[PDB]
Design an enzyme around this catalytic site. Structure first.
Site, PDB file in Angstrom:
ATOM      1  N   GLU A  65      90.202  49.895  84.054  1.00  0.00           N
ATOM      2  CA  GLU A  65      89.034  50.174  83.985  1.00  0.00           C
ATOM      3  C   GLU A  65      88.132  48.963  83.998  1.00  0.00           C
ATOM      4  OE1 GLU A  65      87.749  49.611  80.505  1.00  0.00           O
ATOM      5  OE2 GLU A  65      85.636  49.962  81.222  1.00  0.00           O
ATOM      6  N   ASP A 849      58.161  56.033  79.280  1.00  0.00           N
ATOM      7  CA  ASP A 849      59.395  56.963  78.976  1.00  0.00           C
ATOM      8  C   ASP A 849      59.174  57.656  78.007  1.00  0.00           C
ATOM      9  OD1 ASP A 849      61.617  58.362  79.306  1.00  0.00           O
ATOM     10  OD2 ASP A 849      63.086  56.666  78.729  1.00  0.00           O
TER      11      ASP A 849
END
EC number: 3.4.24.56
Lengths: 948, 11, 5, 938, 14, 5
Positions: A65, A849
């Site tokens: 990973e 945002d």
């Protein structure tokens, strides 16, 4: 195109249309649409943990990973995923569990194709190389090397260790550059072949599930998922599992003795139980967790409190691997709690048998089921990054209909499994674990992975047949009917004077308010918070210590009352600050007054239980002296905010001035603190304006009535100010971390005050170097695992900083930071217009945002009201100024402020060095700071920020 | 995100 | 308190 | 020419040389020849005062003495005396009393010969030009106008003008425009001929005695004064004598209810007696008033203070003129002392009766003689300006052979004199006078000049005959032998730590010590100085109030023991500071430790009286709401400190947070305040180097064992900084005075932080434009009486200031200051090298001298240690730097920091208005500006 | 030097 | 205290 869901269970508060499906290669796919989202996202969860590592090389899944982010063949660039994702207001992150591995990102408004197709190649086809595998294991080594002193990990691996050493549970998850690099080339095992075999064997199969939070439609993105994830081909890999629990009866009924590094005292009581994930409708483990770990009148914790043995105790049932599962009653201990461990566990089996004689209760199930149904029905909005990772992370267990209603809805109360798990709790299944630093010279065995020491004191049958022999009762009881459960769920209508920003409504020399009826969210819940001021709260260390002692004992004596409020959905928080103390009460709309009232009348009319004070005093004296056992970069971030302020007291002042705090001194301190004060507050959510003025009215009238509170003078409502560094000034001073083998550094470039034309210079320059700083200082040069560079704003004065901790000597780090500065500005002058407008758009999307949760805008209002600027519309006008900026503007900001030859250059450095501790410019000779106050005596102080 | 901070994050 | 973990 | 003189009596610790003689015309001269001195002076006194002013013009001696300094015959320019004087480092000053008028100056080492010839021309022949008269009438009016609302002047003129309206004692000494200008030219009398008559016929060679403080020898100064002062012509003017009193026994036994403007309460008792000025061999009045005004066990003030009627008492001889003297006893009254008046006075006659029954004493006369014997043997030398006018003032009363020993020695004991002057103190001779705010409205008379309102009531015969019933003596007894009388006096020899400047000898976390064994003066005396830094004393106005009540109540609870040591020369001061507590014990080296340790173990282990706490609390609340009546030039200085300092609490907030002070509140404050404190000390002068260590060790020991004092961690030895004004910034703060009809102002130019080269820029520019500032504001522009211009040293930051109060609007008055700065911009450049050298010389004479009094060495070493500067040798290094500056550097300093179009210009102004950008509130001002650093210690 | 507390001094020097 | 004239 194998399986399509028709309609699934959603809460009637949400608006997000959903769709579930399953592909031809067996991928569980979930689709989320949102018309009014601003950051779309997706995630994936391969059901393979670090419990499928090969036995020779340890921590392959984590290294895989960690290596998959770098390099594919359809994008051969090293950082094209991270670079493209950071050009578009996104961020990517990942982790490995013991059973599965989560991959997730988020991205801007519509850039779904250009980042999802980059995220798909992740598993479609990855390419590694010599370079990456050679310089990535150093970052995984720094990862383990910062966690070799972390007592949340040392106890975890020591639970993994003393079990069945032939069991896959007794395996190491991280890799420390030794199992990854040094062991496999000690015996000639290749690593790249192991990575390609691991990935092609495990990851490409049916196992993984996906979810994507799209904007467009529920048919625009079904096609997008089908084309990208059709390739990965099913290898028919069955799920790894193992019915044998790692605790075989030879190593049961055992009591270890562990020695920590940080000064703690704890008692772990471990029970093994079979798997109960199959029973997700009755949920017996949550029942026994609610009945064992429950504070309040006459319960397991409150009696151990009353005998002075136990501070707190968390119960519940702890998950494990697929085949097995634990059950834990974890306690902390007082000074004389370690003398009476057998009596503590005796009381634990007293309460177990008292809950085994009464038998299963239906009204407790009905109460818990009503509480979970109400907590599900008004579930707040979710951030699209983190949410899709959770619902991809639990998609493997549940069918398509209850993908959302996980651990919220319960169908049946079956007492047979309650009796089953209540029978598996027996002192033949116990494994006690004691952590204490009083075991310095007594431990025989030591851990190889982490290096901790412990024992084997197997409990002779004296104390077993003292535990289960004769158990009638102490003074325990079952918890009673809850009265903080809510019943009023009516949304009050929007009034005539409806404002978009909180308005000053009351303004007196005693208090002021800021009020807004909730306009966006329409949930019957409203948070409210307060900031009380006192000039006596932070006068000297002693007065900064009675504040924490008083506040803590107030929180201690009120948990008994308000744990039912925290269980019904009303949470409070009361801690101290530098200027005064603090209060914040949030939750469902019906019982804020009752709770706040009881908090105030318990605040003013407050007595002191002497033994509780004498326990908490020591639990704070042992919370000061274990500050030496903590991260180096945190000592940097502590020392910088100590030096760059007007007054601050060290951790060395307060532990000397705890040798003076006594019961009468503290007892006379509360009438001195609550004699003259001033209140500042905002009220937000679902409340009318007359009731807002009535609530704060009742607050200050109760403090008037019980405390004889007078208003403060307006000339003694003051804040603190920041020291002003000289132009062309280079300040550095080093301290030595005593217990961590790493070094650390934090470097500070101070520009100026908070302006509306000067925050966008530093903000845009901190966005232009956000990806390349990571990219060249953690990836390419491998300077460590902790790399962060951004704007710091304390007391108004804004500065750009650098946090980095490493094995290297810190002045090497400061030189390679300066090299990064020079290479960065050279890369700035070369860049084109389109990339510059791309960076401006990335900052105009990150900052413009809207917040989704109601507390995410209450923390947007309160965090500026406590800074005395009161500028609520700085999200619009500031970014409207951001749109008009030229390429020259940033170079003019860089040259005279941040450059090495700059005329206006302010730079201070903190070096934290260890226990025993590509062309850099020439740096001027430093002047060292050997004394903080003599440093701050010859330097001016900035003016404070005028309000808006 | 990571659960209980006992898992291993990339960044 | 219950172990949410 | 006379040839008289003999050995002038002196102290045997003296080294100055003396010679006295008369002239052929009648002037007495005392010649003082001091070769060590750095400045020089001469002075004289004319025995004509303001008591013999012509009746038509209300005050002509004062207007003459204001008009005397202008326009000598030989030097006819108006400013010439003070321009020759101020450039040679001297500044003259003069005054006019009821029976005398002094004229004294001071000058540098060598310019005495070119200074007496400007000073004798005030007496030979003046001009009295009228164009310099119509300007000076306004200056005498502005002198009067600031004293119209001053209570010590209102009570003075009500004391004068209530008596005999025929006697000359009831005349008005000062003059306004009404009596000087307006009354005569209406009536037609020329004031010019009245000045010429009053100076030519009444102002003579007799009634005039001079003195000179030179460095030349005996013989070269005698002929100097003979050469210069023989031209003063004689007239054989008789002395303005009168043997009668102004009280002819019909002005007795009356009570004067006086209404003040300040909220005060006082009780004035007045006894008329004949002259004992011929009786200075026995000096009976000082004996008697010594036994009246004594604060000690079993005394008058102890008994009246023990029952809450009085705060203070003063008793003695209030001399009037030749022919008569008064005898007064003056007390302060409490809330209940105002309405027990006749019982107070009954106690006063009870104690006088106890002095009648005990009769005279001889051991008290022996003690009072030995105390002045040792107070004269070890005599500190006074500054030249002020030592000359003293012994020129008392030269009219004594023979030449005893002038210095005039009031410092006593002859044989005369009991019958004390018995007769004690028999003058009878109840029929009383003049009671009551001053209280509570009499408002009930008063029906007004004083002609000050407007004071008084009501006259004759006291009933029942209270006079009950004051003659005063034989129930009770607890009143004569004072005992004093024990603070020093007997040990030796100098200690110079040890091998022979330092010219004191250094550290101890530096702990608890204390810090500086020590200089004195090497100059060789006196058996010592200064001790202390500072008890504590971080609680100035946190909140409530803590400033509790600090001030703690200090005042401690000083009240200790005076019972301290007053037996004040008489023997052991003087202590205890005061509260924004940082902590200042202690300072000074006097003879014999009994320093007893008084010091008694102060320490009364400061640490201390309890409160409820009755005394209430009286002190009401008195300080009165002293806080009372400040509203103050001169308008002092509200401005109060406001500049309020704005410039980091944090300061006003008078308005102190008196408002004073309401919540209680005894339980104060009882736990004292152990909080003195729990943890840092001490910084100075002590120097006739101490062994180890006895310094002992004297600090027993202080910190007594404090740590009686109060458990712990040391203070060095992160809390913080000091306040100063607000930094923006460049090219002008600020204005306006306020209104309520009591005075005048308008005040203070202009402030911030300049920069203190440095060797900044301090001499600022002081040399302040020495350039000081005498032209006085000349061109007050002599020509006639703005006001008070005018001042100089440096402002606060928090280590320099500044230039202008303080002027006047009748004009202050916004008008600032423009005169700016036009003055333009005028001296033009004058400083068009200027010669020689007079620039004179200007840079006189600063190097004022800054470089040596103080003769040992307390001034303490007042500069301590005055610098408390600044945290430690630069004990500023004088030498800095004046050495001064010798290198040129006129080019001062124009750099001006055109950059002080010119109206200068880049770095820091301008702030206040305004105090009359009863008949801008700064709104000081927290929003000091919030938005930055703060200076602190000075780096040397 | 203004011996009396009351002052008639020509100028005030401070 | 003594007045001191």
């Amino acid at each position: 195109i194998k399986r399509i869901g028709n309609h699934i269970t959603k809460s009637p508060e949400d608006k997000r249309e959903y769709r579930g499906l399953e592909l031809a290669n067996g991928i569980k796919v979930l689709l989320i649409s949102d018309p009014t989202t601003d950051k779309s996202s997706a995630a994936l969860d391969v059901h393979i943990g670090s419990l499928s590592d090969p036995p020779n090389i340890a921590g392959l899944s984590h290294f895989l990973e960690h290596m998959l982010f770098l390099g594919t063949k359809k994008y051969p660039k090293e950082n094209e995923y991270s670079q493209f994702l950071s050009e578009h207001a996104g961020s990517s992150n990942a982790f490995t569990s013991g059973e599965h591995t989560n991959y997730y990102f988020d991205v801007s408004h519509e850039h779904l194709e250009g980042a999802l197709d980059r995220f798909a190649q992740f598993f479609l086809s990855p390419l590694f190389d010599e370079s990456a595998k050679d310089r990535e294991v150093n970052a995984v080594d720094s990862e383990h090397e910062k966690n070799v002193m972390n007592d949340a990990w040392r106890l975890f691996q020591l639970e993994k260790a003393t079990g069945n050493p032939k069991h896959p549970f007794s395996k190491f998850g991280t890799g420390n550059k030794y199992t990854l690099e040094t062991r496999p080339n000690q015996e000639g095992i290749d690593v790249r072949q192991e990575l390609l075999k691991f990935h092609s064997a495990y990851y490409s199969s049916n196992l993984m599930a996906v979810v994507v939070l799209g904007r467009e439609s529920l048919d625009d993105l079904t096609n997008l998922v089908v084309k990208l994830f059709s390739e990965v081909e099913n290898k028919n890999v069955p799920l790894p599992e193992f019915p044998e629990h790692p605790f075989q009866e030879e190593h049961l009924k055992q009591l270890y003795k562990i020695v920590p590094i940080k000064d703690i005292r704890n008692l772990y009581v471990t029970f093994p139980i079979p798997d109960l994930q199959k029973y997700y409708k009755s949920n017996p483990g949550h029942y026994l967790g609610h009945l064992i770990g429950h504070e309040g009148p006459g319960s397991l914790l409150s009696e151990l409190k009353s005998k002075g043995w136990v501070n707190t105790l968390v119960g519940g049932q702890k998950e494990g691997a697929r085949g097995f599962m634990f059950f834990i009653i974890n306690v902390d201990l007082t000074e004389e709690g370690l003398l009476h461990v057998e009596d503590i566990i005796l009381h634990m089996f007293q309460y177990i048998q008292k809950l085994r004689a009464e038998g299963p209760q239906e009204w407790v199930f009905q109460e818990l089921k009503d509480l979970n149904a109400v907590a599900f029905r008004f579930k707040d909005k979710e951030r699209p990054r983190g949410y899709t990772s959770k619902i991809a992370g639990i998609l493997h267990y549940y069918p398509l209909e209850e993908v959302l209603t996980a651990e919220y809805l319960l169908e049946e109360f079956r007492p047979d499994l309650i009796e089953m798990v209540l029978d598996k709790l027996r002192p033949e299944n116990v494994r006690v674990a004691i952590v204490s630093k009083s075991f310095e010279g007594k431990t025989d065995r030591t851990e190889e992975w982490y290096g901790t020491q412990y024992k084997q004191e197997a409990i002779p049958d004296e104390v077993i047949k003292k535990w289960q022999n004769a158990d009638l009762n102490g003074k325990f009881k079952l918890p009673t009917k809850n009265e903080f459960i809510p019943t009023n769920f009516e949304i009050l209508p929007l009034e005539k004077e409806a404002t978009p920003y909180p308005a000053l409504i009351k303004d007196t020399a005693m208090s002021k308010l800021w009020f807004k009826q909730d306009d966006k969210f329409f949930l019957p819940k409203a948070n409210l918070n307060f900031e009380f001021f006192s000039p006596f709260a932070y006068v000297d260390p002693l007065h900064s210590n009675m504040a924490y002692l008083y506040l803590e004992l107030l929180k201690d004596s009120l948990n008994e009352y308000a744990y039912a409020a925290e269980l019904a959905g009303l949470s409070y928080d009361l801690q101290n600050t530098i200027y005064g103390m603090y209060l914040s009460v949030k939750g469902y709309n019906d019982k804020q007054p009752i709770l706040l009232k009881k908090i105030i009348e318990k605040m003013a009319t407050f007595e002191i239980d002497e033994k509780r004070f004498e326990i908490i005093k020591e639990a704070y004296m042992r919370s000061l002296n274990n500050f030496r056992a903590e991260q180096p970069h945190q000592h940097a971030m502590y020392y910088l905010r100590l030096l760059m302020t007007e007054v601050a007291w060290t951790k060395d002042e307060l532990k000397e001035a705890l040798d003076d705090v006594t019961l009468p001194r503290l007892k006379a301190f509360i009438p001195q603190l609550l004699s003259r004060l001033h209140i500042e507050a905002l009220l937000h959510g679902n409340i009318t304006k007359q009731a807002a003025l009535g609530i704060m009215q009742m607050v200050e009238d109760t403090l008037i009535e019980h405390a004889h509170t007078k208003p403060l003078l307006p000339s003694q409502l003051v804040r603190y100010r920041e020291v002003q560094l000289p132009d062309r000034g280079w300040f550095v001073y080093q301290q030595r971390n005593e217990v961590h083998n790493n070094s650390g550094i934090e470097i500070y470039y101070q520009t100026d005050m908070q302006s509306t034309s000067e925050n966008m210079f530093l903000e845009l320059f901190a966005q232009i170097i956000s990806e390349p700083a990571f990219n060249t200082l953690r990836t390419k040069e491998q300077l460590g695992y902790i790399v962060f560079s951004g704007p710091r704003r304390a007391n108004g004065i804004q500065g750009l900083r650098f946090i980095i901790q490493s094995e290297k000597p810190p002045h090497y780090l400061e030189s390679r930071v300066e090299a990064f500065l020079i290479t960065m500005e050279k890369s700035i002058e070369d860049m084109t217009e389109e990339a510059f407008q791309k960076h401006i758009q990335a900052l105009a999307i990150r900052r413009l945002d809207k917040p989704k949760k109601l507390s995410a805008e209450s923390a947007k209002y309160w965090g500026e009201i406590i800074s005395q600027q009161y500028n609520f519309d700085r999200d619009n006008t500031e970014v409207a100024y951001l749109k008009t900026l030229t390429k020259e503007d940033i170079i003019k900001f860089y040259k005279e402020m941040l450059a090495v030859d700059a005329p206006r250059r302010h730079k201070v450095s903190v070096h934290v060095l260890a226990r025993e501790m590509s062309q850099a410019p020439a740096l001027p000779q430093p002047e060292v700071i050997q004394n903080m106050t003599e440093f701050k005596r010859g330097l001016p102080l900035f003016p404070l920020v005028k309000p808006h | 995100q990571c659960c209980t901070s006992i898992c291993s994050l990339y960044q | 308190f219950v172990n949410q973990h």
